[PDB]
Every structure is written in structure tokens, then in C-alpha cells.
Amino acid sequence: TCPFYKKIPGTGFTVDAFQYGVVEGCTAYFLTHFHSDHYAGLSKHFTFPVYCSEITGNLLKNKLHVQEQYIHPLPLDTECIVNGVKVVLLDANHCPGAVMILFYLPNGTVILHTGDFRADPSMERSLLADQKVHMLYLDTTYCSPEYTFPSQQEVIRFAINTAFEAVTLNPHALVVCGTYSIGKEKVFLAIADVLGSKVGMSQEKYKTLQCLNIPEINSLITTDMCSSLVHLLPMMQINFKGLQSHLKKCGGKYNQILAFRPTGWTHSNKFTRIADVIPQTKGNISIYGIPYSEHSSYLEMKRFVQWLKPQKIIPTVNVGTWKSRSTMEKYFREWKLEAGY
Ligand code: NI
């Protein structure tokens, strides 16, 4: 049965609610982004209207085989009417195709559902600037001050400089980058660009990437592994055993591997600056964990909410324990007292 925080009151609408069977009273199912925790339950047999971005729609059709007659893609930054209610989709600064959704309810209530997001000051100049929000359904993934990490731009700078140094010292080193979902494509794209290489990957992953509307993508990726010195592998293979095994398969073209695991936050963020990060090494294999986040840091989240000044906040993440729920509610009250709304 569908939890309350996935239902939009005053509407026929749910958000990211595909794993509950037919939801009583739902006339339109919204999907914020193509990550499995949110799409869980969709397939070619789904026969209700799904509302989403163009990019999400391309993934639904090609990877999950959802039939075309039920996919309803909407443009970003454009007022749309859905079953008699005005909606707007806004870029979430998450993975490709990820949206926040603004619902303008018949009674005058305005609701913002952030999906998954990485808050940014550029959001303060979207269509949000114009009007008041009564209810905010908030991605609270890192809602505690211990959660700090660098900008995406500092993390990419580190990765480009690390990769370019290693391969310039040893032309026979291979770079490997781990993946398990869409998102974080800048990591492997920026490294391949500095090295003058295409990124090499499986057919299944190439297919995924071709649904993302990335400009000049045919210029940046390939399935011909032999021609590439940046390879993508499943995240579970990014360990000394799985990397050794991979180096076997490269037919003595390479004698060293430098590998990257983009994670979210890890506790080494509490102690170590990005500049100072070092790898784990075994023989001719080194692995760097890099804190490339597609969710808000604590301070980013706080700034966004104190700018928005919502009347009520409903968390969508960390809601399963009373200790988490208490922690979040205490921070929301602090932010409101400090900013005076
Ligand atoms: Ni996500």
C-alpha cells in the first residue's frame, strides 16, 4: 500500500509510486527520474498514463519496454495542464532527465515535490521565484550537518588531473570507472576528453547512454573496447580481484590500472580534503573513491529551504526511523527560527 508522502492531496496524482499495484484513486502516475528505487514496478505491461521528462520517457520505452501510448513526456520550464491541473517540470540537478514537479492545486495551494535533487542557487531564478509554496516534499537524503562534500567541479578537477598525470607517466596504463545506474557521467566523460579517447563500454550501457540527449555523444562513447583507454565496468567489479581479471582480457595492451569509484558521501569526508585524497593500491592496481554527489549537501539543502520559505515540509527520505524523523524535524524548526518565516 502506497505511503502518504507519495500522494498529492487534492489531485488524482502519485509520485514515484509504481510498486504498490493499482493505487485507488490515481488517474496519473508521475515519475521524477529513472533510478530503480523510484521506477520499481514499471514494465511493458503497465497500462496507466505515466508523466515524466523526455529523457525519462526515452529510457522507459527502450530499457523497460513501456508501450508508447502510455508515455506522456513534458517539456521543462513550461506550464502544462494534466487532468485539469496546472503543472511545471523543473531540472533537479540530479541524473539526466531528473525533475522537480510544481502542482498548482484547484483551491490555490502550491506544492513543490523535489524528487531527488542537488540544490543549487541557480534554482532561486527558475519559475520558483514568482510565487509562494505551501507544501514542500523534500529529498532529505543528507539532512544532517556531518554531511559535507566538495563541489562537483572540484571533484572533476581532481579526477582529470589524476588521470592525465598517471597516463602521461605511463602510456600503457588503462583507466577504469565504475557505474550502476545513470547519473555521474561527467566523471568518465571528462577523463576520456583529457586523454583524447572515447569511453569504452558494454552494449547494454551504450544503449542507456544513447537515450540521454547528450550533445555530440556519438563522438564520446563506443562499444569497441580495443580502441579505448577509458573503460566502464559495473560498480561491483571495482575491486582488486575484478580489476585483475579485467586486465587479463585486454591482451597485453596495458600493464597498470587506475580505477575510480564515484560514491556519495563517506566518513573519510569528515577528515580528508579532496586535494589530499589517496588511493588503495595492490601491485599494479590503484582505486580512488571520489565523493561525487548528485544529492544536496546539508548546507545546500538548508539554503534552498530558507530561500523558499515553505509553510510545511514533508520529508521523502530517512522516514523509516523515529530517530531520523526527530532529527529532521529539529533542523526544519532551527532553519525557520533563524530565517524568521
Ligand atoms: Ni535518485
UniProtKB/Swiss-Prot annotation:
Please indicate which superkingdom the organism of origin belongs to: Eukaryota
Question: Which tissues express it?
Answer: Expressed in brain, heart, kidney, liver, pancreas, placenta and skeletal muscle.
Subcellular location as annotated? Nucleus
Q: Outcome of D139N?
A: Impaired nuclear focus formation, reduced interaction with PIAS and increased sensitivity to cisplatin
Q: How is this protein induced? A: During mitosis. The mRNA encoding this protein contains an internal ribosome entry site (IRES) in its 5'-UTR. This 5'-UTR generally suppresses translation while specifically promoting expression during mitosis, when cap-dependent translation may be impaired.
Quaternary assembly: Binds constitutively to TP53BP1. Binds CDC27, which is itself a component of the anaphase promoting complex (APC). Binds PIAS1.
Family of the protein in this entry: Belongs to the DNA repair metallo-beta-lactamase (DRMBL) family.
Describe its function: May be required for DNA interstrand cross-link repair. Also required for checkpoint mediated cell cycle arrest in early prophase in response to mitotic spindle poisons. Possesses beta-lactamase activity, catalyzing the hydrolysis of penicillin G and nitrocefin. Exhibits no activity towards other beta-lactam antibiotic classes including cephalosporins (cefotaxime) and carbapenems (imipenem).
Can you name this protein?
DNA cross-link repair 1A protein
User: What species is this protein from?
Assistant: Homo sapiens (Human)
Range within the parent protein = 700 to 1040 of 1040
